[PDB]
Amino acid sequence: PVVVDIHTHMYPPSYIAMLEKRQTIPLVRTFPQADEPRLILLSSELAALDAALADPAAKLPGRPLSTHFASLAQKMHFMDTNGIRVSVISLANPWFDFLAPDEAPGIADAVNAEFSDMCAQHVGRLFFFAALPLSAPVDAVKASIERVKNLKYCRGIILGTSGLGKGLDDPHLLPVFEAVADAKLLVFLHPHYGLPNEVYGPRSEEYGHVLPLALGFPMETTIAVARMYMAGVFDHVRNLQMLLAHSGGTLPFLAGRIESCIVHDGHLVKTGKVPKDRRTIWTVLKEQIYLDAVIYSEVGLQAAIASSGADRLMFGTDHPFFPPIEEDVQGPWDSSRLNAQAVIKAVGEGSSDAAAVMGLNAVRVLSLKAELEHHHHHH
Amino acid sequence: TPVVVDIHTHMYPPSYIAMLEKRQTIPLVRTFPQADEPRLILLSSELAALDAALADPAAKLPGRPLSTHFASLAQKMHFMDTNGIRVSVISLANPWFDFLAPDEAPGIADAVNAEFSDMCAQHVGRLFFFAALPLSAPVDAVKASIERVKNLKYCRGIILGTSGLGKGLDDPHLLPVFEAVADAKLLVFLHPHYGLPNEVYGPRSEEYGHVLPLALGFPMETTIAVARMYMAGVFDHVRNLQMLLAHSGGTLPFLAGRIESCIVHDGHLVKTGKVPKDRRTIWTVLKEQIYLDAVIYSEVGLQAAIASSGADRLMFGTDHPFFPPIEEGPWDSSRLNAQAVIKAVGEGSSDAAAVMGLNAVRVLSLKAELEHHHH
Numbered sequence: 001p002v003v004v005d006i007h008t009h010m011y012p013p014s015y016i017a018m019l020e021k022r023q024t025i026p027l028v029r030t031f032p033q034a035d036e037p038r039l040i041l042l043s044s045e046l047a048a049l050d051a052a053l054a055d056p057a058a059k060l061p062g063r064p065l066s067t068h069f070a071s072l073a074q075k076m077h078f079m080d081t082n083g084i085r086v087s088v089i090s091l092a093n094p095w096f097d098f099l100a101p102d103e104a105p106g107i108a109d110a111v112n113a114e115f116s117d118m119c120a121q122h123v124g125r126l127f128f129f130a131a132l133p134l135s136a137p138v139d140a141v142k143a144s145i146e147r148v149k150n151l152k153y154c155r156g157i158i159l160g161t162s163g164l165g166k167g168l169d170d171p172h173l174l175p176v177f178e179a180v181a182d183a184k185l186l187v188f189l190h191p192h193y194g195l196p197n198e199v200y201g202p203r204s205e206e207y208g209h210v211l212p213l214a215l216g217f218p219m220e221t222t223i224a225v226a227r228m229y230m231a232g233v234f235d236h237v238r239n240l241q242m243l244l245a246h247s248g249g250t251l252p253f254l255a256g257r258i259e260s261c262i263v264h265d266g267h268l269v270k271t272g273k274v275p276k277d278r279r280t281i282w283t284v285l286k287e288q289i290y291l292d293a294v295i296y297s298e299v300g301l302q303a304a305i306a307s308s309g310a311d312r313l314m315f316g317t318d319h320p321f322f323p324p325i326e327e328d329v330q331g332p333w334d335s336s337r338l339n340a341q342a343v344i345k346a347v348g349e350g351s352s353d354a355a356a357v358m359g360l361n362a363v364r365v366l367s368l369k370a371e372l373e374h375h376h377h378h379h
Numbered sequence: 380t381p382v383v384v385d386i387h388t389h390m391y392p393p394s395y396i397a398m399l400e401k402r403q404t405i406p407l408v409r410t411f412p413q414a415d416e417p418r419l420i421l422l423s424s425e426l427a428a429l430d431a432a433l434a435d436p437a438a439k440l441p442g443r444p445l446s447t448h449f450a451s452l453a454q455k456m457h458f459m460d461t462n463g464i465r466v467s468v469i470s471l472a473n474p475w476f477d478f479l480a481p482d483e484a485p486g487i488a489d490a491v492n493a494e495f496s497d498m499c500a501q502h503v504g505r506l507f508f509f510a511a512l513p514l515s516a517p518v519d520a521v522k523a524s525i526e527r528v529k530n531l532k533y534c535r536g537i538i539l540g541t542s543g544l545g546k547g548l549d550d551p552h553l554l555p556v557f558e559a560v561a562d563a564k565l566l567v568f569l570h571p572h573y574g575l576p577n578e579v580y581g582p583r584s585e586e587y588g589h590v591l592p593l594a595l596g597f598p599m600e601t602t603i604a605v606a607r608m609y610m611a612g613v614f615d616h617v618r619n620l621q622m623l624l625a626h627s628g629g630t631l632p633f634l635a636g637r638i639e640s641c642i643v644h645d646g647h648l649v650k651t652g653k654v655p656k657d658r659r660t661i662w663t664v665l666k667e668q669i670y671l672d673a674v675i676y677s678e679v680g681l682q683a684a685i686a687s688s689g690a691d692r693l694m695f696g697t698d699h700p701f702f703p704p705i706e707e708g709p710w711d712s713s714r715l716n717a718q719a720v721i722k723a724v725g726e727g728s729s730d731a732a733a734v735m736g737l738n739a740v741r742v743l744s745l746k747a748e749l750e751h752h753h754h
């Protein structure tokens with residue numbers, strides 16, 4: 001059975017161009033010590049950036065801009081060495097959120113075209129989620145949607161939790177959700193903004209990137225989806241299908257708590273917001289939500305499976321964000337293996353559930369089957 | 380026949396309520412002319428709703444109803460009898476003594492803790508308590524308080540929030556407080572209150588009532604605070620420390636794998652010696668120093684909690700009286716957790732008996748026929 005990675009990223013070289021053109025986060029800079037640039041994407045990296053700008057003895061800010069971000073060859077090598085047959089690549093955070101409304105559409109258009117072209121270089125092994133110019137007007141976002149649905153190898157949309165600027169429960173965003181759903185594009189929801197840095201306290205710099213990445217990201221996703229659900233987006237756009245990064249952040253773990261808090265909320269109940277025919281978060285989880293398996297443990301994975309069903313979980317690696325630190329970056333990646341291992345421990349090696357999670361769900365849901373059969377036969 | 384114990388259950392004694400009535404800023408209790416019960420306004424997220432109500436006498440009532448259940452011991456015993464609970468380990472609810480001025484704090488904490496002990500004396504064998512600490516006072520006053528509460532009949536631990544002395548639980552100044560409590564063999568019950576900065580919920584947050592702050596803010600705050608403790612080495616520096624985490628650890632069982640992966644892949648941590656081979660993993664800490672309550676409302680979350688800490692380290696709770704039925708006996712907020720246990724481990728199993736009470740009996744030495752706390 002085929003192995004598909006649905007959570008895996010690239011920054012096209014032209015996108016990288018923009019990042020070193022930038023004076024504020026997100027940005028890429030080169031520092032005296034290493035000829036390997038620094039990728040500075042997150043609010044949490046700001047304090048260390050200012051410290052490294054005013055002090056050469058201070059630690060390097062952000063993360064290393066490796067060749068694994070921009071090189072298609074590196075991507076294919078990674079896939080070969082980790083037993084991945086197919087990747088559905090996507091532009092990584094922060095996408096186009098920082099662009100002015102007038103320029104975003106044209107930049108998104110070019111970058112999406114680049115991804116299509118990259119996928120064409122290895123027919124049958126590469127597909128992509130397109131990024132949208134969500135800092136631009138809604139009409140431009142719709143036009144961009146119509147365009148990407150007709151790009152070769154596009155199998156959905158990646159979007160962040162800020163939406164148009166006011167999150168995913170913004171009613172102005174409803175027509176974007178409708179446009180994407182009607183175009184039968186899967187929506188891959190992905191974190192970036194995390195939580196305000198103050199929540200991590202005054203010693204946060206001592207803990208590296210662990211708190212914003214281990215906690216901020218999945219909590220952001222949970223909050224964004226909970227907001228969507230509460231505003232009734234899933235009911236208003238019944239054909240919408242969303243894939244959630246990091247097994248829904250914390251959603252499978254908190255779904256019961258969310259439900260109990262809703263049914264026990266005085267204000268909601270007494271103002272008619274909790275009717276008897278109400279679709280529960282569990283229903284939405286079985287009907288409109290898919291979860292990636294980037295969860296690193298059979299503990300989280302089993303919760304995700306129990307929440308959405310084994311036919312709705314999809315393997316991913318988050319390549320290239322977690323390289324081995326002291327092991328060979330050209331060898332197998334622990335960050336990939338940990339997830340595959342979680343799958344095996346949870347549902348058993350060789351099982352049909354394993355096959356489903358590791359690739360077959362993605363094949364079915366993203367309609368990769370005809371491409372795959374062709375390739376295996378004709379290629 | 381086995382004992383059902385509720386370890387997550389609150390009260391505000393009348394004296395404590397009087398203090399809240401007199402306050403001008405949150406936390407406060409405030410009566411409105413159109414309301415039968417006073418309003419309990421505890422959270423940052425309720426601020427905006429409070430101002431709107433202070434001006435416009437037609438805007439919605441702020442905060443939550445301050446029902447009699449908060450102060451009534453008789454209603455506590457009634458809740459227990461009608462929900463099949465033999466034993467409650469009651470605790471002062473958030474925000475405890477966090478808001479008290481430093482000089483007044485130790486005296487008030489001493490009095491309130493003494494009242495809790497006395498309340499437990501009214502129903503011998505059925506009531507124990509977690510004591511709260513005067514954490515706004517200097518650390519030596521806090522230690523003196525710990526030394527007092529250990530001698531109190533029926534006291535079986537300490538409840539505290541995530542702000543510590545004012546800088547969170549990874550604050551090195553807080554370390555001797557953890558040491559003293561652990562040496563006294565008091566279980567620390569970590570509980571949320573501060574939540575998340577309200578901007579994270581967006582401009583439509585008011586429309587969803589309390590759902591986001593309570594369903595997400597609370598457990599997320601718990602996760603962040605404990606993760607900070609772990610990263611700061613608190614669990615290694617205080618090896619005898621035992622902690623009970625509210626709401627099954629918040630999200631920790633679901634995120635433990637992710638935390639470990641982020642650690643081992645952290646370039647800065649690994650390259651500065653902070654990720655040695657002899658590292659005690661979060662998984663190890665979850666099996667050795669962490670207990671989880673079963674206030675999780677689903678067998679899905681409960682199964683993840685059990686897999687993380689073991690069935691011998693999960694404890695039933697209700698969060699009484701914060702989630703009363705709106706329209707209507709036995710509370711759903713209690714029954715949902717019971718049903719989660721039955722569904723996860725099977726009715727009448729020894730796993731069910733453990734989680735429903737026997738773990739708490741063992742860990743908290745819940746035998747009122749003795750004077751001491753049998754470790």
Ligand SMILES: O=c1cc[nH]c(=O)[nH]1
Binds near residue numbers: 093318321
């Ligand atoms: O997708 C990812 C993963 C880790 N860190 C990021 O900034 N983005």
Ligand SMILES: O=c1cc[nH]c(=O)[nH]1
Binds near residue numbers: 473701
């Ligand atoms: O313990 C609790 C539970 C719900 N809401 C609160 O403010 N405190």
Ligand SMILES: [Zn+2]
Binds near residue numbers: 008009190245318
């Ligand atoms: Zn990612």
Ligand SMILES: [Zn+2]
Binds near residue numbers: 123374378
């Ligand atoms: Zn062909």
Ligand SMILES: [Zn+2]
Binds near residue numbers: 570625
């Ligand atoms: Zn509580």
